[PDB]
Amino acid sequence: SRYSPEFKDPLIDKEYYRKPVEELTEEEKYVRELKKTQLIKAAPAGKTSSVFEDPVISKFTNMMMIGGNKVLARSLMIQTLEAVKRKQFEKYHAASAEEQATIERNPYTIFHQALKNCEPMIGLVPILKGGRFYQVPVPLPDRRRRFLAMKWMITECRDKKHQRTLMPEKLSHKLLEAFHNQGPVIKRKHDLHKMAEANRALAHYRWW
């Protein structure tokens, strides 16, 4: 890194700075007076202080980027969000007054919930015991759970099973399926739970 260890990461949050002084504790007062003497890295060109910023969608976009082509990756993302919203507006106008109350039309709410429905609770990690590796079911950290949900969704959309279907139409279709606890990405989560439940006998190999 071209930053020395003395550089601290920037905090990009308008609310954090407009907070009155009276509400601050003696510990939060120390951190604010400390940062006035520290070196701060330049804010990356990715995140800003915008009110439409979504760190989860930004991360999903980078995981779709091929060869640093962010423009194309970002283009596929907004086309998916538009495709999801148009499908929900079409399902909304074609529904009855009672069914309309249960139809979600916010693509950001659908995207977050669809990924949350695909996150696995437990995984298989190799543990060495007696000179052999055993696939031991273990709890996954929050980072790993969220990462696996995104990776499974992107991998499913790149599968060759889809013939000539463009990414925004494929992804929008998979998100709405996962949003309703259906589709192949939900099935992949169930398989990891079934394969972790089969190795239930090896769970005691864990030591944390």
Binding site: K36, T37, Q38, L39
Partner: protein
């Protein structure tokens, strides 16, 4: 506190790393005590100024056009 290489110049002798720690541990023990003026000029002989450059941003002048 002055570094070992600076102490090796005030003394004009070669010091070990552990020799330097022992001397610093003994000066710190002298500050915690109720040291007087005579005991304060002595400790300052071994304190070097660690000037901290201000991180305050420099403001550009406000100009006026035609």
């Amino acid at each position: 506190w002055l570094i070992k290489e600076e102490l090796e110049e005030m003394l004009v002798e070669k010091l070990s790393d552990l020799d330097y720690m022992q001397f610093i541990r003994l000066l710190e023990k002298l500050l915690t005590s109720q040291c007087g003026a005579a005991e304060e000029e002595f400790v300052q002989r071994f304190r070097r100024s660690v000037t901290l450059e201000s991180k305050k941003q420099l403001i550009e002048p406000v100009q006026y056009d035609e």
